Each structure stands twice: as C-alpha cells, then as structure tokens.
C-alpha cells in the first residue's frame, strides 16, 4: 500500500519546491538522479509506508524536449525550501505501476 499526497483535491496543483542535498545518480532509468545545488519540484510525496520515496521532478527546462520526466526519490537527498501546495489529499497507487518503457 503506497499512498501519495496530492497538492489539491482533484490532483491539479503543484506541491512545493526543494533543493538537492547531494549527488545521487539513480539506479538506471527506474529513477532520476539528483546532483548538488540542483533545485527540484515535488509533485507527489509518498508516505505512510514509503516516506523515503517521494515523487516529483528536477528544476530546469531543456530545449527540444519540454515536459521534464518526473521521478521518485527520498527527501533526505533534497531540502524543501519553497512551497505551493494548496492541498494534501492522499492518493493510493495502483498495482500496475508503469515506468521506463
């Protein structure tokens, strides 16, 4: 049972913003990396069972490839400074769980 909190009621709003607390090269596709001095943007935090596994995306907007790829990583690897979460409703994940085709 992995439930994550949403920054709204119908899940249509950002959570907050955080910074990278150090380098953390994800395993391999399954997750995203996090290098020092690298800001991030949380979109969905999974707690109540997997607090160590949050959900969001890193800052930045590369050209010729808009819409960054969201990933999952612990909070310890980052530090939330700014916030913009209007809501905090829980959202249970599905059994499927697709990632990295």
From Swiss-Prot:
- Assembly, per entry: Interacts with FASLG. Interacts with TMIGD2.
Name of the coding gene: MIA
Q: In which tissues is it expressed?
A: All malignant melanoma cell lines tested and infrequently in glioma cell lines.
Q: Which GO terms describe its molecular function?
A: growth factor activity
Q: Where in the cell is it found?
A: Secreted
Alphabetically sorted, this entry's keywords are: Disulfide bond, Growth factor, Secreted, SH3 domain, Signal
Parent-record interval covered: 31 to 131 of 131
SH3 domain residues: 13-83
Q: What protein name does the entry list?
A: Melanoma-derived growth regulatory protein
| Protein species of origin | Homo sapiens
Instruction: State what this protein does.
Output: Elicits growth inhibition on melanoma cells in vitro as well as some other neuroectodermal tumors, including gliomas.
Q: Name one GO biological process term.
A: extracellular matrix organization
What disulfide bonds does the UniProt entry report for this chain?
Answer: 6-11, 29-100
């Amino acid at each position: 049972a992995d439930r994550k909190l949403c920054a709204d009621q119908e899940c249509s709003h950002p959570i907050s913003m955080a910074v990278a607390l150090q380098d953390y090269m994800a395993p391999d596709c399954r997750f995203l990396t996090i290098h020092r001095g690298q800001v991030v943007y949380v979109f969905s935090k999974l707690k109540g069972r997997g607090r160590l596994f949050w959900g969001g995306s890193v800052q930045g907007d590369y050209y010729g490839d808009l819409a960054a790829r969201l990933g999952y990583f612990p909070s310890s690897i980052v530090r939330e400074d700014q916030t913009l979460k209007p809501g905090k409703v829980d959202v249970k994940t599905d059994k499927w769980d697709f990632y990295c085709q």
